[PDB]
């Protein structure tokens, strides 16, 4: 006598009402197990009654967590109070199939008059419901159970392990790869700025040391035909009239016999140089961001060597974890130079281990290893 059953789902609770029991003594035979599987007989057995869907991902997480330990959440109490009829606590309780013997006494202590059954026959029915899924629901299951299943599994497991940023290092890896690409494109696009500006004007493209400030100079100085002493002092407000480059290349522009190029071409040189300027600035910003994220993630390593070098290692060895797993000699950083390097290798492997497995790690041990290798270098 199994009057109702309670199926908890990735979304919401459902309470089914049984109509025919299956037999009890002959519960094992081939005929009766094949009727668990085949849907004509199962729909003779179970008729859906009620279904309260969960309210959000946060409650579905919380309620799965409560089922996992054993107590009864308020939504489960709500639906049970809606569906069960009020019978005597001594004579003829209302039965209920559940699939968790430990979930028994929590239900029983709330409602005194509900006797929870989980025998072979109840387990049988619950298996049947889980197999026949969503056909039984007459369409009510709003929401895609498959995607709910994925999300709920991930959220519950992530919360059991307390997954977070300070141990997350994939940010360090991606920042490294993107920094290398930025510097590659920056020097390439510097080459092309310098070539267009040189093709009308070779000598600043030979005589400016820094390509970034050259890009500022292209953004300010339009061409060799736009020249004045206020621009001289604006370069002085920029890098150096101390060198006298501004005056000298006024002379060079007065002697520069390159093509006086068209205005539209000058505007596109302008745009491309400005774009390079924005990119290089962005690179510097990301570099500082990388330093800060490292001081969160693996402070001891960073203080032991240097932030960007710790980044190099983490990207090589693949992640912080694999850096920890790595044998302390085969870690490679970049005669007696070889010996100090190998000693430092041992040290930085150990410091990486302490960063990996701690929580909010030990800049004091960053300092300890720092002074130790400093003494060895002092010997060297």
């Amino acid at each position: 006598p199994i009057e109702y059953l309670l199926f908890e789902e990735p979304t919401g609770y459902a309470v089914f009402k049984v109509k025919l029991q299956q037999d009890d003594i002959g519960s094992r035979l081939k005929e009766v197990q094949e009727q668990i599987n085949d849907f004509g007989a199962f729909t003779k057995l179970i008729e859906l009654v009620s279904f309260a869907p969960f309210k959000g991902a946060a409650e579905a997480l919380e309620n799965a967590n409560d089922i996992s330990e054993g107590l009864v959440s308020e939504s489960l109490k709500a639906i049970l109070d809606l569906n069960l009829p009020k019978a005597s606590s001594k004579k003829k309780n209302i039965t209920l199939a559940i699939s968790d013997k430990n979930l028994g006494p929590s239900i029983k202590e709330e409602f005194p008059y509900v006797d929870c059954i989980s025998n072979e026959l109840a387990q049988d029915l619950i298996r049947g419901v889980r197999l026949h899924g969503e056909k039984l629901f007459k369409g009510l299951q709003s929401g895609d159970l498959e995607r709910a299943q994925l999300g709920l599994g991930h959220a519950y497991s992530r919360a059991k392990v307390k997954f977070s940023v300070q141990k997350n290092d994939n940010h360090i890896i991606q920042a490294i790869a993107l920094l290398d690409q930025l510097d590659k494109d920056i020097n390439t696009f510097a080459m092309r700025v310098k070539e267009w500006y040189g093709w009308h004007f070779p000598e600043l493209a030979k005589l400016v040391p820094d390509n970034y400030t050259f890009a500022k100079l292209v953004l300010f100085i339009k061409d060799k035909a736009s020249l004045n002493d206020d621009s001289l002092h604006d370069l002085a407000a920029l890098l150096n009239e101390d060198s006298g480059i501004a005056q000298r290349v006024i002379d060079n522009a007065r002697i520069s016999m390159g093509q006086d190029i068209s205005e539209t071409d000058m505007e596109n040189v302008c745009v491309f140089a400005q774009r390079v300027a924005s990119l290089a600035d962005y690179r510097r910003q990301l570099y500082d961001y990388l330093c800060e994220k490292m001081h969160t993630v693996a402070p001891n390593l960073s203080e032991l060597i240097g932030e960007v070098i710790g980044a190099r290692l983490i990207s090589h060895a693949g992640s912080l974890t694999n850096l920890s797993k790595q044998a302390a000699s085969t870690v490679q950083i970049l005669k007696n130079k070889g010996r100090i390097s190998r000693y430092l290798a041992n040290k930085c492997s150990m410091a990486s281990r302490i960063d990996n497995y701690s929580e909010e790690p030990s800049n004091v041990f960053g300092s300890v290893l720092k002074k130790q290798v400093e003494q060895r270098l002092e010997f060297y």
Binding site: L150, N170, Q181, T264, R275, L279
Partner: protein, 255 residues
Amino acid sequence: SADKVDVMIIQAIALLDDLDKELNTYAMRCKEWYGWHFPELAKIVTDSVAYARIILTMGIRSKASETDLSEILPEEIEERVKTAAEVSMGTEITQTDLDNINALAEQIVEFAAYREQLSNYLSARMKAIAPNLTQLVGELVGARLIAHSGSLISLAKSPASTIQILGAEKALFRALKTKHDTPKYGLLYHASLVGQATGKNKGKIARVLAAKAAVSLRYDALAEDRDDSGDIGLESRAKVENRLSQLEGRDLRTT
């Protein structure tokens, strides 16, 4: 008129290629850097620029669920991304990480805008340098022709067959040397007319197009007093068009 230098054109084509490569790799990095908060967004909206603008608009999945996004999406795609926003398997992210992802996404938008600017520049510039050939074959393929063969003048002096086979030299010299049937489209294959034909008519239209392009080029690189109206391009285009209608009218199979 100093606005005629094939040198700036040919290096412009090279830089256009570089732009395409770098833009794709940066959006790859952004899509998976962010998907580490919102995973299935990439697969649902595969476009780089649309992705970057989504990252500018929203920053948190539920923030997107509240916010309009439909400026840059069709609404069914909007519904998918809103629901997957409601339940991703993804995490939440801290503010500094959203900050630098955000700055990356706007930098992606800026390369897209820069490329469009460069192509508009190039189209106007080709209209200035070789407006007949531009008016015939389309200015992208015209610029690629000039880029490959180098000087506009040397391209003028090539015959018409070699303008047909200006792109496919590897397959050409392999076929010639090993006694095999030489390739037949070449670099013109991306013109709109040969992208308009069907089969053997693609091969035939590439002959007619290469010949009329040689006329157009020679009128452009040598006629010192050019009126810049591209009329030889327009005339010969009308000729090639009419050819295409005749070929595609003909029906190979019985009535």
